[PDB]
Amino acid sequence: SPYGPEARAELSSRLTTLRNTLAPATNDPRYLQACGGEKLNRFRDIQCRRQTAVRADLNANYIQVGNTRTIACQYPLQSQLESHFRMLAENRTPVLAVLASSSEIANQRFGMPDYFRQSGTYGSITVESKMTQQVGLGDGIMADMYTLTIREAGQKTISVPVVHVGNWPDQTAVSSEVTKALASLVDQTAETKRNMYESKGSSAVADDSKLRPVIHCRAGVGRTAQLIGAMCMNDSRNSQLSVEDMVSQMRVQRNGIMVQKDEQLDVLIKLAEGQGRPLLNS
Ligand SMILES: */C=C/S(=O)(=O)Oc1ccccc1
Give the atom of ligand 1 at the shortest distance from the alpha carbon of 170: 5
What is the torsion angle, in degrees rounded to the nearest 10, for the CA atoms of residue 194, residue 78, residue 129 and residue 160? 0
Quickly count: other Cβ atoms within 10 Å of residue 234's Cβ: 16
Breaks (C-N over 2.5 A) in the chain follow: none
SS3 110: helix
Tell me how far the alpha carbon of residue 199 lies from the centroid of ligand 1, in angstroms.
36
Residue 89 makes CB contacts below 8 A (sequence gap 6+) with: 125, 150, 152, 155, 156, 158, 160
Taking the chain, what is the end-to-end CA distance rounded to the nearest angstrom? Answer: 14
Q: How was this structure determined?
A: X-ray
Tell me how far the alpha carbon of residue 261 lies from the centroid of ligand 1, in angstroms.
10
Q: Is 217 a catalytic residue?
A: yes
**131: β partners:** 146
In order of start, what are the domains of the chain with their CATH numbers? Answer: 1-282 (3.90.190.10)
User: What secondary structure letter does DSSP report for 276?
Assistant: T
Give the C-alpha separation, 67 to 273, whole Å.
20
Residues with CB under 6 A from ligand 1: 99-100, 170-171, 216-225, 260
Give the C-alpha separation, 136 to 133, whole Å.
10
Nearest Cα to Cα of residue 15 among 257, 228, 225, 216: 257
Residue 87 carries which side chain, given as an amino acid letter?
A: M
Nearest Cα to Cα of residue 124 among 92, 83, 161: 83
Give the C-alpha separation, 196 to 115, whole Å.
24
Give the atom of ligand 1 at the shortest distance from the alpha carbon of 260: 12
Residue 139 makes CB contacts below 8 A (sequence gap 6+) with: 174, 175, 177, 178
Give the atom of ligand 1 at the shortest distance from the alpha carbon of 218: 2
Q: What is the DSSP string of 174-205?
A: --HHHHHHHHHHHHHHHHHHHHHHHHTT-GGG
Secondary element (H or E) of residue 136: strand 125-138
SS3 70: strand
Tell me how far the alpha carbon of residue 260 lies from the centroid of ligand 1, in angstroms.
8
